[PDB]
Design a binder for this molecule. Structure first.
Ligand SMILES: *[C@@H]1O[C@H](CO)[C@@H](O[C@@H]2O[C@H](CO)[C@@H](O[C@@H]3O[C@H](CO)[C@@H](O)[C@H](O)[C@@H]3O)[C@H](O)[C@H]2NC(C)=O)[C@H](O)[C@H]1NC(C)=O
Ligand SMILES: *[C@@H]1O[C@H](CO)[C@@H](O[C@@H]2O[C@H](CO)[C@@H](O[C@@H]3O[C@H](CO)[C@@H](O)[C@H](O)[C@@H]3O)[C@H](O)[C@H]2NC(C)=O)[C@H](O)[C@H]1NC(C)=O
Ligand SMILES: *[C@@H]1O[C@H](CO)[C@@H](O[C@@H]2O[C@H](CO)[C@@H](O[C@@H]3O[C@H](CO)[C@@H](O)[C@H](O)[C@@H]3O)[C@H](O)[C@H]2NC(C)=O)[C@H](O)[C@H]1NC(C)=O
Ligand SMILES: *[C@@H]1O[C@H](CO)[C@@H](O[C@@H]2O[C@H](CO)[C@@H](O[C@@H]3O[C@H](CO)[C@@H](O)[C@H](O)[C@@H]3O)[C@H](O)[C@H]2NC(C)=O)[C@H](O)[C@H]1NC(C)=O
Ligand SMILES: *[C@@H]1O[C@H](CO)[C@@H](O[C@@H]2O[C@H](CO)[C@@H](O[C@@H]3O[C@H](CO)[C@@H](O)[C@H](O)[C@@H]3O)[C@H](O)[C@H]2NC(C)=O)[C@H](O)[C@H]1NC(C)=O
Ligand SMILES: *[C@@H]1O[C@H](CO)[C@@H](O[C@@H]2O[C@H](CO)[C@@H](O[C@@H]3O[C@H](CO)[C@@H](O)[C@H](O)[C@@H]3O)[C@H](O)[C@H]2NC(C)=O)[C@H](O)[C@H]1NC(C)=O
Ligand SMILES: *[C@@H]1O[C@H](CO)[C@@H](O[C@@H]2O[C@H](CO)[C@@H](O[C@@H]3O[C@H](CO)[C@@H](O)[C@H](O)[C@@H]3O)[C@H](O)[C@H]2NC(C)=O)[C@H](O)[C@H]1NC(C)=O
Ligand SMILES: *[C@@H]1O[C@H](CO)[C@@H](O[C@@H]2O[C@H](CO)[C@@H](O[C@@H]3O[C@H](CO)[C@@H](O)[C@H](O)[C@@H]3O)[C@H](O)[C@H]2NC(C)=O)[C@H](O)[C@H]1NC(C)=O
Ligand SMILES: *[C@@H]1O[C@H](CO)[C@@H](O)[C@H](O)[C@H]1NC(C)=O
Ligand SMILES: *[C@@H]1O[C@H](CO)[C@@H](O)[C@H](O)[C@H]1NC(C)=O
Ligand SMILES: *[C@@H]1O[C@H](CO)[C@@H](O)[C@H](O)[C@H]1NC(C)=O
Ligand SMILES: *[C@@H]1O[C@H](CO)[C@@H](O)[C@H](O)[C@H]1NC(C)=O
Ligand SMILES: *[C@@H]1O[C@H](CO)[C@@H](O)[C@H](O)[C@H]1NC(C)=O
Ligand SMILES: *[C@@H]1O[C@H](CO)[C@@H](O)[C@H](O)[C@H]1NC(C)=O
Ligand SMILES: *[C@@H]1O[C@H](CO)[C@@H](O)[C@H](O)[C@H]1NC(C)=O
Ligand SMILES: *[C@@H]1O[C@H](CO)[C@@H](O)[C@H](O)[C@H]1NC(C)=O
Lengths: 383, 383, 383, 383
């Protein structure tokens, strides 16, 4: 009988229930504890702490508390300022750091003990660039929201120096959802081919404002960078004649994965979606799908390593954990068929640049898979 | 008799002498200790610690050591990953954090206790954009080096959506100085109007490689984003017929400032510039000029606040410093005429968006001031 | 066992080692003395004297000293003022005079006893004129250094009276290497097609100054009159996109000749090339290559004439040497395959107007043979 | 009573009488010996030797014979190959060398003991260049005879790089007076503005052949480089309507000079001019006029130096003559009003670049002075 303790550092909300990632972290730990073939005779427990996500000092205190109590991994603070602080703690004290969201990896950072399960925007900007070639675009307009979106789509911005695109980079307004002065300039500029770098909460907001202005016609085509395009109530836009392409790594066409999504709406039951926020009703985001996967990919590594004993490391007397070097190598060699497809890592750095997308577009009936993407193959679009 | 202790967290070098910022921090503290009108009867001492600059854990330990010994300010780790960790420590424990280099301020960071003395690239990208209007450019090519340079020049990249520029964003090769495959594509692409986002060490390297390929003619024009264009041995390029514009905030035309630059070459004497690195011989970089200024701008605040007593704060029992709220307000209200012009801060956030540049170009005689820039006025170019 | 004594009159240097011609004269005499098939059972010795090269009185004293001791040939004073004095001594006293450098032969000079091994500029000005036809030039600019260069390139200057060239004859500054006021007039005059009449020491100097001004672009083409274009460190100019044509009589593509060039760097070892003089490291000049050949071509004549006995001639009682008439006819009928190709003489006067050049140009990889020249054939340019 | 012995090295003719320079050397020495104010109580004697003029060995033997007998000056071998040999003898042994004909002074010749009385072609090529400006020429054709004529007229050849001339350099045939294939190309090329670099013997020959072909019309203009244009029987060309410009330094408009020219035809009486050689009957050439002057300019120096004693110098034991340094300085400071105008020398090198020409042209009446030239003033053409 073993007691492994996966750490976690999640968002602190005062009014609603626990977040989507903290639910999926608790739902995953309960899944391996019930299921018997994966990790027999062990009992995964958890040590979830809650932070502000914008406080690198508070994230570093909770990371040293989890190392003092003793963890075998830390499943990310999930924000760029807080994740870089906890990554360097986990690098110095041996213990792995599991990331499920994208952040800017600075080029001269010699950190080994981290893996990210979010699909890398080195690969995702090539998938978007393959679509604008397939659709024969020449007047692309990238619309992002925050200044880090330039780093995300940098291979798309450098594309007119190797092809015949003509980019017109624009930015959403600072914090307000008043995208109407942006969309007036896009409508007057005759820009019919738009790539949005947004989240699905902000994709839904500007799609209501593109309806009310001029822009949900059969002349406009919208590629979406977000992987949660399948979580939009697209009922006002089905008959609109529009073309709305995108991607989806959440492999919802398996019977096994769709079983878990149907289980997900049960225990989540609280926090209903407010009506003028036209996301769909019951779904896993790809944010929570990668946190459900991250517990399983580390679980592949602990099944291949049974003699693990959790130690109580100390930050101001920082010494590496005894099995931190081998167990990190088992996480970077782990293969898993999770909610988000195949999960293999990039041996050099530790990212997911090898993954399987599903190109989805908006048809009259609904929002349907019209192709596939694969870094080896490319676009296999059976449209 | 007072004993104020300004902290500092600088780069650790194993072979050469102390860095340019740590020299200028020691040279500034010795200057106020000698000079009598600024801070009478007090003695500024220092507590310089040395880190790797790429280790947010090591930067956070040295910041808690300086808070344990007791400081009244921390003069920056001077790298983006390390500065964001020490900013959140200084925000939680009251003590100000003085920054002298640019880093990405994420938009939802509610940090108050920090000021940056580096000229903001919100203002510097408008100064570069005013030059490409004045020079009547329409085929601009931005060349940057690291992925954060997109965030720096984002107002220049968004400019073809409000003017008639046609940007072609390119990137230098990853770490090597083999910019020849980049410059072949720029020469074959007939790109004569280039903006380089580099440092002066990398500006000197690609200017040697632009000479040897095709590109230092009278057809090519080079705007440089760096503020240390005046520190290039431009003797191979004076008669080249080229046009090489740029900026300079280091106000070298005063008798008072040029006295300090002449003092600077004396005590620095070690570490000579190697010959195939064609920077000039004796100069302050704008990196060290802002660290000389940062000690003085905080010195204006302590002259207006004589009853300051340094306290010994603790990180794991984090309580704000007693005078941290008032003394931070005096730093954000400080005015100073330093090496880099007028130093006034941006009351909203804490940046320098109000500063005085000097547009310099390459003439046959040398590298001379051909104008001025000011966020209020604009380009007053007496060419 | 014979003792033949070839005379020699070379440059007197006070600081460095012996000159390139005096080394090659000593290296050649040692070669025939070792090698057995050419001249069996004889031992060539030498009688090298050193002069100022600008003193026809001192050159005439050393020539009468060598005739008093007794020589069978004199291998040139190698300067125009000194060579004409020693030519008339050798004509009056019978003994041959071997020349390895060009000088102005006045038309009414009835001298028989001399041969020159330097390629005649009657033939070399036609080879340059064939290149400006092949390259379809019409705006040729000849740049020479001393006033005798007009005599050298006179068939190139008389060419617009039989073709459609438009010559613009210019001269380098008097003694200084300040060719920048010359190159300003050539750049402002839009003169992209330049023929330089220089030595390789002065070709290297003005190529550094053409780089620093405007002129090493892909618009400028430089034909070089010198036969030592292969002895330039052209590493700063390979990627420059320039076109730099020229000639080479030193037949470096044979295994036998390249063996001797590899032997040459061994014994020469002293006198390294100073860095800002960007000639290559180890090479025979064509000046020393013709002095290595001149000992061998005379050696062909003494193998065909075994009964030669060296006599002690006197200048103030001038009587011709007994075998001077026959042995001079054997030198003018000698054939040899030396370092500089085939060596046959011009029966009428005694020059080399029949020789084999190798047209070399500057490519991106290096400086490569792009054709051939031959007075019979013409340009066979397999470019 | 003194006995000064001026040396001389002149041409050896086998059939006719002594040459024009040797007559004028004997006529000048007889003139100072008769006349009493210039050199009282001294008796100039002479030591004229005769050479082949194309033998630098024979010229060097006669120069050492005159130094052995003892001379105070040597009045030139008067040919370029022979003069450079005797110049270096006179430089090494102290004794001055007086030149009366042009030769190529190589630029790195450090010879002090020589003066030339022939007008320098540095100044004479500017006088020809001032005429082609005054006559508003733009299609100039230079015709020379030997390859040294390029060195003579080099400032005229370099003139299209600073003005709007368009030179077409041509050469007379090698030795024959068959200039008809040259004049066919000049007539077919529509070249009406011709500069001839010739002697007056060859100017008369090609003027007979320009009459018989097409070219003595009112369309053709001929500038002559020779200073003996006044010695042409121009009676067939007076009414021809031609324009034939030229120069004249022989100052035939003085009563004193025209007395000497009338004396000259008396003692010369032998050697009549053959009819088909249409030079005039009785005249001093400027060759003999400068030899008459050269004895007088040296005579100014010996009047200012009475204690001169002629010494017997030796060539193979070469030691400078005791008063050679001072007496050479008196020749370079001598002023004289001779047959050829004012005779002042060029302190730097020793040439005549300051002289007074007389521009003469062909009118219907005869060949008349139409202007003046002076290096200070320029063309004062009272036409
Ligand atoms: C509960 O059972 C297993 C617990 O191990 C869960 O994961 C699976 O673990 C086994 C251990 O090697 C592997 O079996 C695979 O099962 C899938 C069923 O979809 C089948 O397609 C494969 O050929 C193989 O038999 C596998 O590593 C892993 N499954 C996957 C998809 O990676 C399993 O997910 C849990 N649920 C059920 C309903 O079994
Ligand atoms: C592990 O990580 C490295 C670096 O992230 C991966 O290297 C990258 O691999 C791709 C494919 O070889 C390189 O080229 C790109 O490929 C697309 C394929 O669609 C092609 O269309 C483009 O020509 C594009 O250049 C990419 O440059 C390369 N990056 C570097 C720095 O070498 C590597 O593939 C990963 N290993 C895996 C996934 O096994
Ligand atoms: C010691 O530090 C004091 C700092 O106050 C220096 O005194 C003054 O410092 C500033 C230079 O930043 C100057 O004051 C200003 O001058 C302008 C005109 O240039 C005037 O408009 C302002 O009202 C203000 O006075 C001033 O140059 C300088 N004072 C003097 C006399 O130079 C002081 O120079 C420092 N001492 C040493 C030895 O460096
Ligand atoms: C304190 O900070 C804020 C922002 O950090 C400063 O406001 C900024 O002011 C500039 C100039 O007025 C605005 O930028 C540009 O104005 C130019 C005028 O030519 C024009 O090309 C564009 O329309 C562009 O907007 C900038 O928008 C504005 N920032 C914000 C967020 O509104 C403010 O001036 C600072 N206070 C000081 C220096 O006292
Ligand atoms: C010693 O000198 C003799 C000179 O005869 C060298 O023998 C031969 O010299 C010439 C090189 O100039 C070559 O002869 C010719 O070769 C061509 C083919 O390359 C052939 O067509 C001719 O019929 C003639 O034979 C030849 O390379 C060379 N002989 C050998 C065996 O290499 C001899 O090489 C000199 N010895 C040394 C040690 O250098
Ligand atoms: C011995 O010497 C004489 C001259 O030193 C050589 O004669 C010269 O031969 C060349 C070539 O045939 C003639 O030059 C040029 O011919 C080209 C053919 O393309 C043409 O562009 C011109 O018409 C030009 O004349 C040159 O005129 C001629 N020289 C003389 C004085 O006739 C002779 O070939 C030598 N003997 C040998 C190498 O056996
Ligand atoms: C014979 O008499 C003198 C001998 O000395 C010859 O040359 C002249 O020498 C005197 C001595 O200084 C100078 O007199 C000048 O005479 C000319 C007459 O043309 C006059 O114009 C001057 O104002 C001055 O009085 C002078 O240096 C020199 N003459 C010249 C022209 O340079 C003279 O040439 C001989 N013949 C006659 C007829 O006197
Ligand atoms: C002594 O000899 C030197 C060198 O031969 C003479 O120097 C030369 O003098 C002229 C006049 O200053 C220079 O310029 C030329 O002048 C003409 C006048 O008509 C003018 O039109 C042109 O602009 C032309 O450049 C010439 O360059 C200069 N040479 C050198 C090497 O400096 C000097 O004048 C002589 N001294 C005398 C005659 O007192
Ligand atoms: C949607 O996609 C189809 C197929 O690529 C294309 O024909 C159509 O024009 C697109 N709609 C747009 C661009 O509005
Ligand atoms: C596209 O998918 C089909 C069906 O799975 C398969 O033939 C192959 O993977 C792809 N086709 C091509 C031509 O690559
Ligand atoms: C540099 O300045 C000159 C003169 O103002 C002008 O050619 C242009 O502004 C620049 N040169 C270029 C772009 O070649
Ligand atoms: C720019 O030039 C002068 C120099 O300082 C300045 O005084 C003037 O006011 C400015 N001109 C403008 C802003 O038009
Ligand atoms: C050099 O060669 C290239 C290719 O043959 C051609 O541009 C031309 O011949 C030369 N280049 C010039 C004159 O710029
Ligand atoms: C030039 O090229 C080849 C290569 O050596 C040569 O054999 C051939 O005879 C020549 N071709 C001609 C002269 O047409
Ligand atoms: C001779 O000179 C006059 C005056 O310069 C000129 O008018 C005439 O045309 C000239 N004769 C020619 C060029 O044949
Ligand atoms: C031309 O000569 C006249 C008369 O000798 C005289 O006025 C002056 O020297 C010259 N005139 C000018 C204007 O130079």
């Amino acid at each position: 009988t073993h007691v492994l303790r996966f750490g976690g550092i999640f968002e602190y909300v005062e009014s609603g229930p626990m977040g989507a990632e903290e639910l999926a972290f608790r739902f995953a730990v309960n899944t391996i504890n019930r299921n018997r073939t994966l990790l027999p005779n062990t009992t995964l427990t958890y040590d979830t702490q809650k932070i502000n996500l914008y406080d690198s000092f508070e994230a570093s205190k909770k990371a040293c508390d989890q190392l003092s109590l003793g963890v075998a991994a830390i499943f990310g603070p999930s924000h760029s300022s807080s994740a870089n602080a906890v990554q360097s703690i986990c690098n110095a004290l041996g213990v792995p750091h599991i990331q499920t969201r994208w952040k800017h990896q600075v080029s001269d950072n010699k950190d080994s003990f981290y893996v990210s399960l979010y699909p890398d925007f080195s690969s995702l900007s090539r998938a978007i660039l393959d679509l604008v070639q397939f659709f024969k675009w020449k007047t692309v307009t990238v619309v992002y929201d925050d200044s880090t979106g330039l780093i995300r789509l940098q291979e798309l911005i450098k594309a007119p120096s190797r092809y015949n695109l003509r980019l017109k980079i624009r930015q959403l307004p600072a914090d307000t959802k008043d995208a109407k002065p942006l969309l007036k300039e896009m409508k007057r500029g005759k820009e019919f081919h738009v790539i949005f770098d947004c989240s699905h909460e902000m994709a839904a907001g500007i799609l209501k404002q593109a309806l009310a202005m001029g822009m949900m016609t059969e002349y406009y085509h919208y590629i979406f960078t977000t992987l949660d395009l399948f979580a939009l109530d697209v009922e006002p836009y089905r008959y609109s004649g529009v073309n709305m392409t995108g991607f989806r790594i959440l492999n919802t066409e398996n019977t096994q994965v769709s079983s878990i999504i149907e289980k997900w709406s049960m225990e989540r039951l609280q926090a209903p979606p407010k009506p003028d926020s036209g996301l769909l009703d019951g779904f896993m985001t790809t944010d929570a799908a990668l946190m459900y996967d991250a517990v399983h990919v580390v679980s592949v590594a602990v099944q291949q390593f049974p003699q693990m004993t959790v130690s109580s490391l100390q930050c101001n007397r920082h010494k590496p954990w005894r099995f931190g070097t081998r167990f990190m190598s088992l996480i970077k060699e782990a293969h898993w068929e999770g909610l988000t497809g195949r999960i293999t890592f990039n041996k050099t750095n530790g990212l997911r640049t090898d993954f399987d997308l599903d190109v989805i577009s908006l048809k009259e009936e609904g929002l349907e898979k019209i192709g596939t993407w694969d870094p080896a193959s490319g676009l296999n679009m059976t449209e």
